[PDB]
Each structure stands twice: as C-alpha cells, then as structure tokens.
Design a protein around this ligand. Structure first.
Ligand SMILES: Cc1cc2nc3c(=O)[nH]c(=O)nc-3n(C[C@H](O)[C@H](O)[C@H](O)COP(=O)(O)OP(=O)(O)OC[C@H]3O[C@@H](n4cnc5c(N)ncnc54)[C@H](O)[C@@H]3O)c2cc1C
Ligand SMILES: Nc1ncnc2c1ncn2[C@@H]1O[C@H](COP(=O)(O)O)[C@@H](O)[C@H]1O
Lengths: 252, 319
C-alpha cells in the first residue's frame, strides 16, 4: 500500500525584487524557497492514512526540480515520509504544469502507488493544473479541491468532499486508485512551521525533447511588475493611525 | 473563427461567471464574422437556455451527459467533442473549482495551448496573448501559444464584464460522448458551525487573518468589533482552524460580503480568493505589517502597523 505525494518547493520574492535583464523571470537572488503550503496538508493527509491503518502504508514524496528541492524533501522525510524522490535534469528548466505532469507520471508509473495526492495549486505560480495533468497522463479517476477524504487503504472507492464556491461542499464517490488535489484545511498539519533518491530524465526514459520550455503549452513573452492599485498609506504613530481609522469609521 | 465558451451551473442555477466569459469572448474576437459558441453541460441543462440566450451568444449547445452537475470525466469528454465539432481558435472556461477538475487534463491529451487564471487577453494581430500572475500575484506573466490552432484558457472570475440584454442564438442539442464516469456525485453539503449572522447582509466588517497568530488573540478582535459595531469576519485559514465559524469566512469559498460598505482587513495578505469576497467594498482599510501584501493594491487606506497595537489603541480611543 503506497501513497505518492507530489510536492513542489515554491519561491516567494523578497522586497525590492527585480526582473532579470532578459525579462523572462525574476532575478533568483530575490527568491526564498520553501515547501508549497498545500503540500503540508497533502503530506499530512497521507500520514493520517498511514497512522489510521494496521496495513503498511508507504508514503513517498516526489518533486521535479533542481538540487535546492532536496532541502524540502528532507523535511518531508523528517515529518515521516518513508521515501523521497527528486527528478531533474537542466533540460527540464521552464517546464510548465503539463510537462511537469508528464515527468511526474513517468515516476508514478514505476512507483505504482494506490493513491496520488497533489496540492490544489502552488503558492508561487498558482496554475492549479499539475495534479490534474498527472491524472490525464495516468488515465486515472480524479477530483480537484478535496477538503475531506474517507478512504481505507485497499478500498476500490473513496468518498471525498470538494470545497466549492460560496460555502458549500460536494460529496463525491470516486474510484481508486485516484489522483486527488488536496485543499487547505483538510487537516491540521502537526509540524506547522533515508537519503533522497535522485532520478535523471534518462532514468525515466525521457530526453531534453520531452521537457522544458519548448514542450510547454504556452510560451512566456515577458514577466513584468505591473502598475497596481495604491492605497492611501496613513503614516504616523499608532495613536494617529488609530485616530484616522476612527474618523473613517465615523465618516461611514 | 469560433470562440467556445463553457458555461457553469450548479444546483439549478447558472453561475454568473458564465456571462463574464461571454463578455470576454465577444471582446476577444477579431471580426464581426467571428462567432461565440456557448455550451452548457448537464443531464437537465435545457433549463438554462433562456438564461444563456443573451447578447453575444451566436450558438448555444446543450450537451446532455450522465450527470446533473459537474463531473470531470463527463466534462472532459464533452468539451473535447465540442472542440472537435466547432474547431474553435479559443476555448474559455471559468477558473472555477469545477474547471479545476478537468481543464488541465483536457490540455494534456491534445497539446492545445493552455493557460489558467488569465485576467488579460487580447489578439495582437493573429497572436493570442494572455496575461496571468506570477510569484503570488507580484508580477504579470504574459504568454502566447506559438503554433497552437486551439488555445484553452481558464478565466479569472470577476474580471471581465458581462454584456447587457438578450440574444437569439441558434440552439442545438447534442448527447455527450458515452463515457462511464469514474466518480459519482452525492450530496451537496453545508457543514456545521454557528450561523448567527448572515455576513452577506452586513454593512461594516472587521476581518481577521492569519496575522492574528494564535487562537487566544481572536477574543480581542471580537471585542474591538463589538465596541466598533462591526461584524467580525475572517479569512479562510482562521475558519479552517475552527477559530471562527465558516459562516464568518469571506472569499471565493466563503461568502461575498455584498452589503459591506466598510471592510477593515487586519492581518490579511489579500489572496485573490479572499479578494473575490470583498474587493467590491467601497471603503477598505488594510492593517498589515507587509507593505508588499496584495491587500494594499485594493485598499483605499493602508496602515503598515502591528495589528495588536492598532487594535488596543482603537479600543482605547473608542471607549
Ligand atoms: C480554491 C481556493 C479557494 C479559496 N477560498 C478562500 C476564501 O474563501 N477566503 C480566503 O480568505 N482565502 C481563500 N483561499 C485561501 C487563500 O489561498 C489563502 O491561503 C488565504 O486567503 C490567506 O489568508 P490570510 O491572508 O489570512 O493569511 P496570509 O496570506 O498568511 O496572510 C497573513 C498576513 O498577516 C500579516 N501579518 C502577520 N503578522 C502581523 C502583525 N503582527 N500585524 C499586522 N499584520 C501581520 C502578514 O504580513 C500577512 O500579509 C482559497 C484558496 C483556494 C485555492
Ligand atoms: N515541480 C513539481 N514537482 C512535484 N509536484 C509538483 C510540481 N509542481 C507542481 N506540483 C504539484 O502540483 C501542486 C501545485 O499546483 P500547480 O499550481 O498546478 O503547480 C503541488 O502542490 C504539487 O502537488
């Protein structure tokens, strides 16, 4: 019994970040990397399944990315993931959600898990695409935005609740194995803050022609800092800031 | 050329985003001669033709599938067949929870052009150029789709304006491809939690976010809200944690505070999903120690200050 959890090490930008000279991305000097928030919940959900079960449940985390990602994978192991896999070659640089979907699927075909979990979206690019792309390449049952999962290892169906717009859920009975994209709030990750197996493209039968920017389903023309709305910033002491809020409250 | 628009309905109601997409599609097309094709999918979807017989709909296709409401296998098969039948240059889906279920699967099989959560779209010559966010909304990423004769876009809700008035589309009925879905929809659910106040009716909100830190800190903001005469609401994480009821949650998956005239956002970054519930509010005050917080891009007033210090001083001054 095996749950494979696809995880992403996301980038967040520091203040005063700048676009690269080529205009295709932000300068990496301004990026701080950490595990995608959604992945904390997906991993916790797999761990909850492992702990609920008498049957052995192997929890394997898999990420497609460069060597920085090892740090995130190690923390997943420290939190109780059984194994961790990083897939990379430089040729994979610029791979969009669909291409990463394809790469992940090549690993999943070999791991042959009973369930695959992915986050609903990434905090950085927020494609909300990768997990469901995996489901397509696997040709597996799937559901996106899962806020509750009723599943016992070995079951050929699960009941999920998807979190919908406007404060409602929908119960869905789904065939297993399945790919599920996991939503914030499904659980309360306990650690709220074994080597890593390194896999090349060759190791999974892929080449530069299968991956990277040229194989993606859109091309970046440019990235830029848009002019956005600007607030009226109330400077001063805490007293005068509060005083101004109350004046606005009284105006209202 | 044809632009295909996939409408969205749930629980017998058409989701308004459907009309936003039609607005988008009509704005997008290159000549008058171009046609907007709208499809509505569901086992009882004929119900929606009046609501979809609106300005800017040239053709309305009612697709009868096995499920009443969204099912990802049904929708994927159906939309694939629509694309096959209509050869659209562009397919517009809402960036909605339903679309999340299948949009990127559709795009994986066929290598159509694909981009999600798009909030600018135009033709430059014959080149489709879509813009979406990057790095937690801190940049715009502008993309095109070289050599893709069909591009599938999901469209950010509440960005594109609907057209006004009725239309006279040619209405057709098709059966969805015969696919046995690998899931079955069961009950819709509204989960427990207190519901003493309907936050869509209230005019003055103080809303708290993850910046409050610990559940022990909720009480002081409840007190401030009480003293000010505001209704206490929150962002999703606060409700997720059980610290306030889900009925107080503002945003896409919570409530839209349609009645709110003054919204004080405290320790809330301003995610797109939170903004969906409150960006319409005519006076938004944001209190947040991160000047790079998205919330400041829609707030009228910004205070870059510690929320606890502000809360204490507000309390003192009000009393
Ligand atoms: C499909 C889907 C649906 C969603 N629906 C919703 C929804 O309905 N509602 C919603 O809210 N979210 C929704 N989200 C969740 C969303 O992605 C965010 O996780 C959430 O909005 C972030 O909440 P936050 O602003 O409270 O926390 P964060 O983004 O972590 O913000 C915390 C903020 O507090 C500030 N802060 C910290 N300490 C202090 C201090 N001492 N003083 C002042 N400021 C401080 C920080 O600078 C930061 O900006 C949805 C997401 C998905 C994908
Ligand atoms: N490079 C990656 N490696 C592994 N999983 C990924 C990767 N990129 C995205 N994902 C998965 O997809 C989710 C993010 O959604 P998306 O916004 O579509 O990228 C993450 O939580 C992972 O589950």
């Amino acid at each position: 019994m095996k749950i494979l959890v696809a995880v992403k090490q996301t980038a967040a930008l520091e203040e005063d970040f700048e676009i690269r000279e080529d205009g295709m991305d932000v300068d990496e000097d301004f990026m701080m990397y950490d595990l995608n928030e959604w992945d904390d919940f997906s991993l916790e959900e797999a761990m909850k399944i492992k702990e609920s079960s008498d049957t052995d449940v192997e929890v394997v985390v898999v990420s497609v990315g460069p060597d920085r990602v090892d740090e995130s994978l190690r923390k997943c192991l420290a939190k109780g993931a059984d194994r961790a896999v990083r897939v990379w070659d430089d040729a994979a640089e610029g791979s969009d959600a669909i291409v990463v979907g394809r790469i992940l699927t090549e690993v999943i075909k070999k791991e042959a898990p009973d369930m695959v979990f992915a986050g609903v979206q990434s905090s950085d690019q927020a494609y909300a695409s990768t997990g469901i792309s995996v489901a397509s390449y696997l040709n597996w049952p799937h559901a996106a935005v899962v806020a509750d999962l009723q599943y016992k290892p070995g079951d050929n169906k699960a009941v999920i609740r998807r979190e919908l717009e406007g404060g409602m859920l929908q119960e869905v009975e789904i065939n297993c194995p399945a790919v599920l994209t996991i939503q914030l709030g499904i659980n309360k990750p306990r650690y709220a803050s074994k080597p890593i197996e390194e896999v090349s493209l060759a190791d999974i039968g892929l080449s530069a022609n299968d991956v990277g920017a040229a194989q993606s389903m859109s091309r970046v023309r440019r990235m830029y800092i848009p002019e956005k709305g600007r607030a009226t910033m109330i400077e001063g002491t805490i007293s005068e800031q509060a005083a101004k809020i109350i004046q606005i409250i009284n105006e209202f | 050329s044809k632009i295909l628009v996939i409408a969205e309905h749930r629980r017998n109601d058409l989701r308004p985003v459907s009309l936003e997409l039609i607005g988008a599609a009509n704005g997008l097309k290159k000549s008058g001669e171009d046609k907007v094709v709208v499809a509505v999918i569901g086992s009882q979807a004929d119900a929606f033709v009046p609501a979809l017989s609106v300005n800017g709909v040239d053709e309305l296709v009612v697709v009868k599938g096995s499920s009443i409401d969204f099912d990802p296998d049904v929708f994927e098969a159906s939309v694939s067949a629509l694309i096959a039948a209509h050869n659209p240059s562009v397919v517009l889906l809402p960036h909605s929870v339903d679309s999340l279920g299948y949009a990127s699967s559709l795009a994986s099989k066929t290598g159509y052009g694909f981009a999600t959560d798009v909030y600018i779209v135009e033709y430059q010559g014959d080149e489709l150029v879509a813009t979406r966010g990057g790095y937690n909304q801190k940049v715009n990423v502008e993309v095109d789709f070289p050599g893709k004769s069909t591009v599938v876009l999901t469209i950010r809700p509440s960005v594109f304006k609907p057209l006004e008035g009725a239309g006279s589309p040619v209405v057709s009925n098709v059966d969805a491809p015969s696919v046995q879905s690998r899931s079955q929809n069961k009950d819709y659910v509204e989960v427990g939690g207190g519901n003493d106040i309907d936050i869509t009716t209230v005019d003055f909100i103080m809303s708290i976010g993850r910046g409050i830190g610990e559940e022990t800190n909720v009480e002081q903001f409840r007190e401030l809200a009480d003293e000010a005469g505001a209704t206490l609401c929150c962002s999703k994480p606060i409700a997720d944690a059980g610290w306030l009821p889900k009925s107080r949650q503002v945003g896409q998956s919570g409530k839209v505070v349609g009645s709110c005239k003054l919204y004080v956002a405290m320790g809330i970054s301003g995610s797109i999903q939170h903004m969906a519930g409150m960006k319409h509010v005519p006076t938004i005050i944001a209190v947040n120690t991160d000047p790079g917080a998205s919330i400041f891009t829609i707030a009228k007033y910004g205070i870059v200050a510690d929320i606890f210090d502000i809360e204490e001083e507000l309390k003192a001054q009000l009393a």
